[PDB]
Amino acid sequence: GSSGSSGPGSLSGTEQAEMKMAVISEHLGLSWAELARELQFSVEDINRIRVENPNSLLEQSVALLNLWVIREGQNANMENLYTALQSIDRGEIVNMLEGSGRQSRNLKPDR
Fold it and tell me: Which residues carry this modification: Phosphoserine?
């Protein structure tokens, strides 16, 4: 009995979530386009974001994520998001974002 924190179904409502999402957009920059299309986002939505976030790319990534979250609503899931990223050859983010990093040293092989 170690783990114990209210949240039987916390979705994008935890300190971590905020960080992850934000970060994803930080690196996204351009990939955002590819990532968007991956989520079955028609040009309409895409092009729009470009005209709504012409200032810089970072803004485009942020806006996009916000959309995906809304559209999905509840069905949304961090996993699915990661899967879409890798699809467009953008797994480096999920790696730098999620990496427990463990090592099981080995003294010697036993029969």
Answer: 10, 42, 100
Q: Encoding tokens for residue 109? A: 């092989």
The Cα–Cα gap between 93 and 85 comes to: 8
Cα–Cα distance measured from residue 72 to residue 66, given in angstroms and rounded to the nearest whole number: 10
Contact 52, 63 (CB under 8 A): yes
User: What is the rounded radius of gyration, in angstroms, for the C-alpha atoms of the chain?
Assistant: 18
Closest by CA to 89, choosing from 35, 21, 29, is 35
Tokens of 107: 């003294």
Helix spans in the chain (H): 15-28, 32-38, 43-52, 57-72, 78-87, 92-97
CATH number of the domain within which 11 lies: 1.10.533.10
- Asked if 34 and 66 count as a contact pair (C-beta separation under 8 A), the reply is no
- Structural domain including 93 reads 4-108
